[PDB]
Design a protein around this ligand. Structure first.
Ligand SMILES: *[C@@H]1O[C@H](CO)[C@@H](O[C@H]2O[C@H](CO)[C@@H](O)[C@H](O)[C@H]2NC(C)=O)[C@H](O)[C@H]1NC(C)=O
Ligand SMILES: *[C@@H]1O[C@H](CO)[C@@H](O)[C@H](O)[C@H]1NC(C)=O
Lengths: 55, 338, 382
């Protein structure tokens, strides 16, 4: 699938390790993670998953 | 249940005219006005967010704007758009407004806050949309000629088009500093505050806790609230964050431009009378109508005129033929009798 | 069998009568009418143009320091560092220092979001392919023939082989360089790629509408910001495409000579009334009837009860006859000043036929050939 990056580790864009409620748990590091993946083709898959809450 | 407005926030940005030609830090500041739509529709970008409450929930009757230091709720009803006269708002979502405006030289976008206080932002913008078809009409008809035109779709959904976003800069605030008794007291109030003093000892940070600067004056110090938890549009009216480098983000935007169909009325066929190598037309227009004609030979000699009211036109019909176009109607062809 | 060659003027909506005379066989009358004449030129897309977008990010206000401009490979990239700037925000001054503060203003030009929807295409037009739609009154029925007017495209309808053209005039309303916007075509000597001028057509050039790389020349110059104000003021030539949209004038549909109708997707010239069109019809042997096999016409007389000299068939003529046998007979006017509406009539014996004719003469003296026998008609048209 489509890979995204978090500092030194690789993960699938649709599945960040912070799930569920990435922004609610830690807003600063969620935005930093999104900023590091803007050039990545699977950015919008990461944006969708990171800004989704309610488990 | 994905919400992009959790991360983003409304903001205060520079406006050259907040009323009476005076500049201010506006909560309704104008960013960009798009006029690519041939139907006359304007896509306006503003510093506030429409249809979203402070708690991030979507509510069409509500509007969120930056009130001094923190965002506040305002009514959607109070939102207005005007050029030389008031505009007709066709769609609103986040930082974007869709409006049909009359001819003007300026563009004003405003709203009414909690304790009244009308906030508006005026920018110099030449608005004179070109005519769709060959007839300058006032009201759009149900039935008419289908002509290609472009518009910004009324759909809420955000696909295709996008904007750049980033963390906001440090917001300066002098209310954070006080004198105790003749020294400097910085009250953090559960925020990350960046402070600098023209005194020795400690004058750096970036502090998450309350700090005191002994033997220092309030005028010698500078305090600013850092955010880092929120996103903001990459606005040229707001400064860039000094700490971080070229860190950028991107979000999809509503109302993208697309090709549609515009209904245009066809002017009533004039009463036609013929003569020796000439045609006589009694034109009765209800609104400005374009009248064009050409010869169907080697020398076409194209001529055009906008017919405003009742006018009789005498046109010479050559042996090669004459083609006449009256508004949105199909061209009439005339030939002399052999 | 017999090949009939005739030439009609290149004019749409005008029915023309042609007499087919095969030696030793009964004459045949064919009505021909041009329904449409299409001139589609071969296109070569040079580039597309649209409204440009001036991308201006947040200005880098370096408090207590000097910002530095870096050379970025971006279209119309502009960078300027302004010294002695003391900017103010909502809660006072943005910078701690009174002195050494700088503002870095950044700007570049790229394709607008509108470019996929609102755009003009620059094409190279060369060697137009001519095609024609012709209505033929063949054997009492209307047949439609669609063929290329090059003289080397045979189309067979009802066993009759049709060869249309070549066109007498090679004239086209389109020049070597053309500009296309939606349903409008313009004859324009557009600037080549990488040669576009600011505020004019081609200020922004894209080879294809999906292209990532674009050419830009908009005269973008960054200005010094106002005292205590955070903003990026600039001077730039207004959109060349937006300017062209209002200054393009009337399209080829309105300006082209010979009454040309201009259509798009693909771009073509329809019904250009220029020159003539040769038509070749190869009629098979079976369609023709021998003089011994065909009905013989004797004791013929012609009378004109009503006539009006006009563009339409304002004349009426009654022809009495004596036929040897039953069969189909062709009707044709031997005088060029008179034209008969009907091409074929059913012959019986000692009966009479009624024909409709068109003339411009007040005193119309004309000969009517019914099958292989001629009859004189005298008409006083008003
Ligand atoms: C708006 O109209 C244009 C034509 O004026 C559409 O044309 C495009 O069609 C293709 C697929 O979208 C692409 O090859 C090009 O972008 C363009 N090509 C041609 C030959 O016109 C375009 O799709 C329309 N845009 C939208 C957003 O609907
Ligand atoms: C078809 O032929 C008939 C004669 O039978 C004629 O009246 C008519 O004009 C022809 N059709 C057209 C479209 O001109």
């Amino acid at each position: 699938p489509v890979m995204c990056l978090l500092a030194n580790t690789t993960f699938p864009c649709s599945q960040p390790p912070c799930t569920p409620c990435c922004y609610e748990k830690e807003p600063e590091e969620t935005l930093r993670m999104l900023e590091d993946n803007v050039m990545r083709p699977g950015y919008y898959q990461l944006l969708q998953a990171s800004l989704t809450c309610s488990p | 249940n994905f919400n992009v407005y959790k991360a983003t926030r409304p903001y205060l940005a520079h406006c050259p005219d907040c009323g009476e030609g005076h500049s201010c830090h506006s909560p309704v500041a104008l960013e960009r006005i798009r006029n690519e739509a041939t139907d006359g529709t304007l896509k306006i970008q503003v510093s506030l967010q429409i249809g979203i409450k402070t708690d991030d929930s979507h509510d069409w009757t509500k509007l969120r704007y930056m009130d001094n230091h923190m965002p506040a709720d305002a009514e959607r009803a109070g939102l207005f758009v005007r050029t030389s006269a008031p505009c007709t708002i066709t769609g609103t979502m986040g930082h974007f407004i869709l409006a049909r405006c009359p001819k003007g030289e300026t563009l004003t976008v405003g709203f009414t806050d909690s304790r009244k206080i009308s906030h508006s932002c005026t920018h110099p913008f030449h608005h004179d949309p070109p005519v769709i078809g060959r007839e300058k009409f006032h009201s759009r008809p149900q039935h008419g000629k289908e002509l290609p035109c472009s518009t910004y779709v009324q759909s809420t959904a955000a696909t295709t088009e996008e904007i750049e976003v980033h963390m906001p800069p440090d917001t300066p605030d002098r209310t954070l500093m006080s004198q105790q008794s003749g020294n400097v007291k910085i009250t953090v109030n559960g925020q990350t505050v960046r402070y600098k003093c023209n005194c020795g000892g400690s004058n750096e940070g970036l502090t998450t806790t309350d700090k005191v600067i002994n033997n220092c004056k309030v005028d010698q110090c500078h305090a600013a609230v850092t955010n880092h938890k929120k996103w903001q549009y990459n606005s040229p009216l707001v400064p860039r964050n000094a700490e971080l480098g070229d860190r950028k983000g991107k979000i999809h935007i509503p109302f993208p431009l697309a090709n549609v169909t515009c209904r245009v009325p066809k002017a009533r066929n004039p009463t036609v009378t013929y003569g020796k190598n000439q045609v006589i037309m009694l034109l009765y227009p209800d609104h400005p109508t374009l009248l064009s004609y050409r010869n169907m030979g080697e020398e076409p000699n194209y001529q055009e005129e906008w017919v405003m009211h009742k006018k009789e036109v005498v046109l010479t019909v050559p042996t090669e033929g004459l083609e006449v176009t009256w508004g949105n109607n199909e061209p009439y062809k005339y030939w002399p009798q052999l | 069998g017999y090949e009939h060659v005739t030439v009609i003027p290149n004019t749409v909506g005008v029915p023309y009568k042609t007499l087919v005379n095969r030696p030793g066989y009964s004459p045949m009358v064919l009505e021909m009418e041009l329904l449409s004449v299409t001139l589609e030129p071969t296109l070569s897309l040079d580039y597309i143009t649209c409204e440009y977008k001036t991308v201006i990010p947040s200005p880098y206000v370096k408090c207590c320091g000097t910002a530095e401009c870096k050379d970025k490979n971006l279209p119309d990239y502009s960078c300027k560092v302004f010294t002695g700037v003391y900017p103010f925000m909502w809660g006072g001054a943005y910078c701690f220092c009174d002195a050494e503060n700088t503002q870095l203003s950044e700007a570049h030009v790229e394709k607008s979001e509108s470019c996929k929807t609102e755009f003009a295409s620059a094409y190279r037009a060369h060697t137009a392919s001519a095609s024609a739609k012709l209505r033929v009154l063949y054997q009492g029925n209307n047949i439609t023939v669609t063929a290329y007017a090059n003289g080397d495209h045979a189309v067979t309808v009802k066993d009759a082989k049709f060869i249309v053209g070549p066109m007498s005039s090679a004239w086209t309303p389109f020049d070597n360089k053309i500009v296309v916007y939606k349903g409008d075509v313009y004859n324009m000597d557009y600037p080549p790629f990488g040669a576009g001028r600011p505020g004019q057509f081609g200020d922004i050039q894209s080879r294809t509408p999906e292209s990532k790389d674009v050419y830009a020349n908009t005269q973008l110059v960054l200005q010094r910001p106002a005292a205590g104000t955070v903003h990026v003021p600039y001077s730039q030539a207004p959109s060349g495409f937006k300017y062209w949209l209002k200054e393009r004038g009337a399209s080829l549909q309105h300006t082209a000579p010979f009454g040309c109708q201009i259509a798009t997707n693909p771009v073509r010239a329809v019904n250009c009334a220029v020159g003539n069109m040769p038509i070749s019809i190869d009629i098979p042997e079976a369609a023709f009837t021998r003089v011994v096999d065909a009905p013989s016409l004797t004791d013929m007389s012609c009378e004109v009860p009503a006539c009006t000299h006009s563009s339409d068939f304002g004349g009426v003529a009654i022809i009495k006859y004596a036929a040897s046998k039953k069969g189909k007979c062709a009707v044709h006017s031997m005088t060029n000043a008179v034209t008969i509406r009907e091409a074929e009539i059913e012959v019986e014996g000692n009966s009479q036929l009624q024909i409709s004719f068109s003339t411009a003469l007040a005193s119309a003296e004309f000969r009517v050939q019914v099958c292989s026998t001629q009859v004189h008609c005298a008409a006083e048209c008003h």
